[PDB]
Amino acid sequence: MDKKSARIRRATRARRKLQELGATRLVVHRTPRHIYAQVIAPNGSEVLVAASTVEKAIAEQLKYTGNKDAAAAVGKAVAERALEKGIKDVSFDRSGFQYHGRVQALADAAREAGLQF
Amino acid sequence: TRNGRDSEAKRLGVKRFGGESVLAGSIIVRQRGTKFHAGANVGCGRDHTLFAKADGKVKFEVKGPKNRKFISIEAE
Amino acid sequence: GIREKIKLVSSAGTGHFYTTTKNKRTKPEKLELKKFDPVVRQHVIYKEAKI
Amino acid sequence: MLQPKRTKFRKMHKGRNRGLAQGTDVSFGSFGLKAVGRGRLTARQIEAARRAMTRAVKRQGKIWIRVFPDKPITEKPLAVRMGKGKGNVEYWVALIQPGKVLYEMDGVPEELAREAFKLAAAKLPIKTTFVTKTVM
Amino acid sequence: AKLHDYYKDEVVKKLMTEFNYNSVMQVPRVEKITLNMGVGEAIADKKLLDNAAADLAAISGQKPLITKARKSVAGFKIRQGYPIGCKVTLRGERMWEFFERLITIAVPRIRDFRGLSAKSFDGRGNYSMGVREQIIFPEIDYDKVDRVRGLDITITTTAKSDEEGRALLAAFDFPFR
RNA sequence: UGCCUGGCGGCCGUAGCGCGGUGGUCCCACCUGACCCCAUGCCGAACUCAGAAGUGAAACGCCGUAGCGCCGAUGGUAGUGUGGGGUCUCCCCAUGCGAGAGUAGGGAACUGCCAGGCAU
RNA sequence: ACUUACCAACCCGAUGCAAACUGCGAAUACCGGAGAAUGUUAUCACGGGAGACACACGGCGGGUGCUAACGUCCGUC
RNA sequence: CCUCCUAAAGAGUAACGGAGGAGCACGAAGGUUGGCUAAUCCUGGUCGGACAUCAGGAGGUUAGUGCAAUGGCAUAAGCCAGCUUGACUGCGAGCGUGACGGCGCGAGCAGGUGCGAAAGCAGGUCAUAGUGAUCCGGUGGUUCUGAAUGGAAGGGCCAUC
Ligand SMILES: [Mg+2]
Ligand SMILES: [Mg+2]
Ligand SMILES: [Mg+2]
Ligand SMILES: [Mg+2]
Ligand SMILES: [Mg+2]
Ligand SMILES: [Mg+2]
Ligand SMILES: [Mg+2]
Ligand SMILES: [Mg+2]
Ligand SMILES: [Mg+2]
Ligand SMILES: [Mg+2]
Ligand SMILES: [Mg+2]
Ligand SMILES: [Mg+2]
Ligand SMILES: [Mg+2]
Ligand SMILES: [Mg+2]
Ligand SMILES: [Mg+2]
Ligand SMILES: [Mg+2]
Ligand SMILES: [Mg+2]
Ligand SMILES: [Mg+2]
Ligand SMILES: [Mg+2]
Ligand SMILES: [Mg+2]
C-alpha cells in the first residue's frame, strides 16, 4: 500500500466506532508543510469549526507551518473557535497518523484551551 | 467409509423481518458469519447473532462500497 | 486428556479458589494470576495448588 | 469410451430431465445430428454411433461430439434386498433434452454426412434429425 | 557519502545528456542495496546461520534479519518458520559507503577477476549479482572465518528499463564486461 | 459568482481499469536533513521529527478517449400459483406473476459542508 | 547443451454439464403492519375427561429402487 | 455430538440416502493498544536444483484461520510487538430454541481490574463439535441446623472433585 491508502486503512476502524457512538469528532490532517483541524458533526457531512496553517491569521505568527509549535497553535485555535459556538465535548480522530509529535501537540493544546476529550 | 450421520438443525435465520416492532434485546437474526452486519441500534453477539439495542422497528438495508447487508433499528 | 484440573487459591487468606486446567508436562511451573476475590472484594494474587 | 477423468463425488441423485436443450445450433462443423426426443445416452451408445459415422466417412473430414456422459448410474445386483446403501456405479450417461445437437461434421459432402448420420442414428435410443449450419 | 556526492555532481549530469530527460526526477537513482545469504544447511547445524549473520554484519555495518521459511517444501526438507537465511537492506550513507567498498576494494579482490556481467538485470533496471567467496571483503578475517560462504547482491534502482539501469551503474565505473 | 486545490461525508462501478493529454503561485506530492522526539524481528522504505535547494518524473488531481469492466430495455424464451386437460419419466390449454442469458442502447459519475489559492 | 510425425497444465476464443457450483434469479410460501366484509370465537389462557403415537391410496416436489412394484422413505394437498 | 447436501428460496423435515469430522487444544493460540497483509505466476540473482533465502513486476485473498464442513473475515476474525489477567464476582431489560430436564444470545446495572492520550474495548478463543442427568460419597469455606442443655457428630447452603 502507498502512504495515503495505508493511512486511510489505519483510520477506518476508529472512524466507524465514532460514527457508531454518534460522537462529534476533532479531525486532524497533517502534511509535511501544514497541519489542519476540523470539528465535524456526527453526520460527517458538515464542519462546525475549523483552523489550520493555510489561514493567513494563524501562519503570520509562526516560524514554520509544518512543525510542533504550529500544531499547538492550530490546536489552541480550534478549541477556542469551538467553545465560542458552544461545542465542548468531542472525540479525537488521529486520521491514521500516530498519536505523537505534531498530532499530539495539536491535541494537548486543544485540551488545554478547554476542549473535552 | 460408512455414512449415516448428521447433526441437529441449529434453527438459524431471520427471527424478526422488516418493519417488525421489537423490544431492546430481541434477536433479529441467528447466523453463522456476518451475512448481515450490525447497523444503528443493533449489536453483534459472540455467535454473530444480531439483536436490538433499542425498542423500535427492524430495518434491513444495503450500504457501503462492498454492498453489505446491514440490520438497524428505527425509532417508532 | 493429557490436561489436568488445578485450583488457583487466594493469597488473601480466604478459602476462595478459581478452578482451571494445565498441561503439567510443557508448563511445570506453578500458575500465578491476579484474580478478583469475592470475600475480600479485591483483586489479589492467586497461586496454583492440586485439585 | 467417454467418462469424466475425475469427479468431486462418486454418486449422484437420480434427478429429473425436464426442459429443452442448450446448444441447439451447428457451432463447429457444417452438419449436425440433433435430438428430437428426450432421454439418456450411455457412453457405449455414444461410442457405437461415433464408430458408425467414422467408418461411413472412411475416417475423412472432421467429427465433433457435443455431448458428454458426466452422470454416474448406479445399480443393485441380483439377490440383493432394498437399502443397505446406494448401489455401485456401473456406467455413465448424458441427459438429453429435445434440441441437443449431439454430433457435428464437416470436410465431407452433404449426401455422405446424411448417410453417416443415418447409420449413427440407428444406434441411439432417442429420435434424431439431420441439421445444417445457419447464418445466425 | 563519497559516491552519493559523485552521483549528484557527475552521474545526474551524464544520464540527463544520455537520455534527454525533461525532469531531473526521471534520472535513475540507486534506491537500495540488498545483501542476502541463503544458508539452507542451517537446519542440520543451527550455528552455521549465526556465522553467516556475523559475516553479513561485518560486510555491511548493520544487524542482519534472519529470514525464515515462507512455506514448507518436501524437496529441501524444510518446515515453515525455519531460519533458512539472513538479509540486510542498505539505504543512504551505509549503502553508498558499501557501494564504494564493493567497486574500489571488494570486487577487484575476486579470484581471476575479468569483469562482472552486464546482462544480469531483471528486465526493469534492477541489477543482481552473486559473490562466491565472502573473503573478498576486507571486513572479514581469513584466519577467523569458519567456512567459505557466498552472498547475493541486488541493486534496486528507479530506472524503468535495463538500458537505463546499465547506464546508471556504468556512470559509477562499475566493473562490467 | 467562476476556475483550481486540500479535508470530511453522501452514493457504492453509468462511479472502476486502460490508453492519450495536462497541472506546481497556492495546495498536494515526491523531495532535503536526521544527533534528537519517535521508529526498523535489518533498513529514516514505513512510522517520525527539523525543514525548503530541486521537480512535477512518479503519485495524485483534472480534461479527452468506448479496448475492457459496469449499467441495460422492448420483444421472445424458461419457470411457476390457481383451475382444466393429454399420448402423464414429460407436456398442453385458460388466467395471473414472469426470469437468466443475449440484443438495441447507456456510459469517461453525480452530490453536500468547511478551508485555502486565483480571477472578475 | 541440441532436437523430435508424441503427450501437454495455465492463458485466449468457441460449446456443454452440477444434490453437496453461483459474478443471476422467479412463481409461490412464510414473518410483520393497517383496513372492510364474512365466519354460531373459528383465537389464546387455565382447569376436568380422553383417545392416539400399525396408517392406505391418489396428485404435486424429491431421496432410494430400474423415474420397477398395489415397493420404500420424507415434504405438501 | 458437529458440518454440508437430500430439504421443495422463513423454521423444521425420513431412509442400513450421499460426503466428512468431534470426545480436544491454548496462560497465549486469551484481553487491549499500536502496527502489518496473502496464494500463485513471470524476470534477474553464490553454492541453489521444478520448489529454500534475496530483488523487481504481474496478481489481488484464489492465501490464512490449532482441526471437518459450511457461513464469515481487510475496519480484517488473518500476521507481529509492548503492556497485561475481563479465561473478572454479583446480576440482568429483552429474546432465541426446546414436550421436558435443559441449552443458547444479550445491552444495561453494582463492585473491582487490564489496555489506550482519548472516544473506547475486554464476562475467553471467527462462529457452530470437544460431552454425562440424578443418587451416593470426598475436599475447602460458611450470620444456617445441632433430638434435655453447652458442644460435637451428622445434615443444609456456597465452591469444587
Ligand atoms: Mg521523507
Ligand atoms: Mg506526471
Ligand atoms: Mg415486468
Ligand atoms: Mg429482475
Ligand atoms: Mg433481463
Ligand atoms: Mg448481464
Ligand atoms: Mg455511446
Ligand atoms: Mg473559498
Ligand atoms: Mg388445553
Ligand atoms: Mg410406538
Ligand atoms: Mg409410527
Ligand atoms: Mg406416512
Ligand atoms: Mg405402499
Ligand atoms: Mg429451509
Ligand atoms: Mg420452503
Ligand atoms: Mg486466533
Ligand atoms: Mg488495531
Ligand atoms: Mg528463477
Ligand atoms: Mg489510564
Ligand atoms: Mg444439645
From Swiss-Prot, chain A:
InterPro entries for this protein: Ribosomal_uL18_bac-type (IPR004389), Ribosomal_uL18_bac/euk (IPR005484)
Domain of life: Bacteria
Gene3D superfamilies per UniProt: 3.30.420.100
Keywords recorded for this protein, A-Z: Phosphoprotein, Ribonucleoprotein, Ribosomal protein, RNA-binding, rRNA-binding
Domain-related comment: The basic N-terminus is not necessary for binding to 5S rRNA. It is however required for cooperative binding of L5 and L18 to 5S rRNA as well as for binding of the 5S rRNA/L5/L18 complex to the 23S rRNA.
Protein family: Belongs to the universal ribosomal protein uL18 family.
Name of the protein in its database record: Large ribosomal subunit protein uL18
Gene of this entry: rplR
From Swiss-Prot, chain B:
Cellular component per GO, a single term: cytoplasm
Gene Ontology biological process terms in this record: assembly of large subunit precursor of preribosome; cytoplasmic translation; cytosolic ribosome assembly; positive regulation of ribosome biogenesis; regulation of cell growth; ribosomal large subunit assembly
GO MF term (any one): tRNA binding
Domain of life: Bacteria
Protein's name in the database: Large ribosomal subunit protein bL27
Keyword Iron: no
Subunit structure: Part of the 50S ribosomal subunit. Cross-links to the 23S rRNA. Cross-links to the A and P site tRNAs.
SUPFAM superfamilies (UniProt xref): Ribosomal L27 protein-like
Cross-referenced NCBIfam families: L27 (TIGR00062)
Parts forming coiled coils: none
Pfam families noted in UniProt: Ribosomal_L27 (PF01016)
Protein keywords: Ribonucleoprotein, Ribosomal protein, RNA-binding, rRNA-binding, tRNA-binding
Family affiliation: Belongs to the bacterial ribosomal protein bL27 family.
UniProtKB/Swiss-Prot annotation, chain D:
GO biological process: cytoplasmic translation; ribosomal large subunit assembly
Modified residues (N-methylmethionine): 1
A single Gene Ontology CC term: cytosolic large ribosomal subunit
Keywords annotated in UniProt: Hydroxylation, Methylation, Ribonucleoprotein, Ribosomal protein, RNA-binding, rRNA-binding, tRNA-binding
PTM remark: Is hydroxylated on Arg-81 by RoxA. The modification is nearly suppressed when E.coli is grown in anoxia.
One function term, GO molecular function aspect: structural constituent of ribosome
Residues the record lists as (3R)-3-hydroxyarginine modifications: 81
Pfam families: Ribosomal_L16 (PF00252)
The keyword Ribonucleoprotein is assigned to this record: yes
InterPro entries linked: Ribosomal_uL16 (IPR047873), Ribosomal_uL16_bact-type (IPR000114), Ribosomal_uL16_CS (IPR020798), Ribosomal_uL16_dom (IPR016180), Ribosomal_uL16_sf (IPR036920)
UniProt key word Cell wall biogenesis/degradation: no
Gene3D superfamilies linked: Ribosomal protein L10e/L16
The protein's role, per its UniProt record: Binds directly to 23S ribosomal RNA and is located at the A site of the peptidyltransferase center. It contacts the A and P site tRNAs. One of the last ribosomal proteins to be assembled in the 50S subunit. The simultaneous presence of uL16 and bL36 probably triggers ObgE's GTPase activity and eventual dissociation from the mature 50S ribosmal subunit. It has an essential role in subunit assembly.
Family: Belongs to the universal ribosomal protein uL16 family.
Subunit architecture: Part of the 50S ribosomal subunit. Cross-links to the A and P site tRNAs. Interacts with assembly factor DarP(YjgA).
Protein name as catalogued: Large ribosomal subunit protein uL16
Curated annotation (Swiss-Prot), chain E:
Xref: InterPro entries: Ribosomal_uL5, Ribosomal_uL5_bac-type, Ribosomal_uL5_C, Ribosomal_uL5_CS, Ribosomal_uL5_dom_sf, Ribosomal_uL5_N
PROSITE patterns the UniProt entry points to: RIBOSOMAL_L5 (PS00358)
A Gene Ontology biological process term: ribosomal large subunit assembly
Coiled-coil features, chain-numbered ranges: none
Keywords: Acetylation, Ribonucleoprotein, Ribosomal protein, RNA-binding, rRNA-binding, tRNA-binding
GO-annotated cellular components: cytoplasm; cytosol; cytosolic large ribosomal subunit
An MF annotation (GO) of this entry: tRNA binding
Record keyword tRNA-binding present: yes
Residues modified to N6-acetyllysine: 2
Pfam families: Ribosomal_L5, Ribosomal_L5_C
Function: This is one of the proteins that bind and probably mediate the attachment of the 5S RNA into the large ribosomal subunit, where it forms part of the central protuberance. Its 5S rRNA binding is significantly enhanced in the presence of L18.
Description of how the protein assembles with itself and partners: Part of the 50S ribosomal subunit; part of the 5S rRNA/L5/L18/L25 subcomplex. Contacts the 5S rRNA; cross-links to the P site tRNA. Forms a bridge to the 30S subunit in the 70S ribosome, contacting protein S13 and S19.
Protein family according to the UniProt entry: Belongs to the universal ribosomal protein uL5 family.
Note: Identified as a multicopy suppressor of the slow growth phenotype of an rsgA (yjeQ) deletion mutant.
Protein name (record): Large ribosomal subunit protein uL5
Gene that produces this protein: rplE
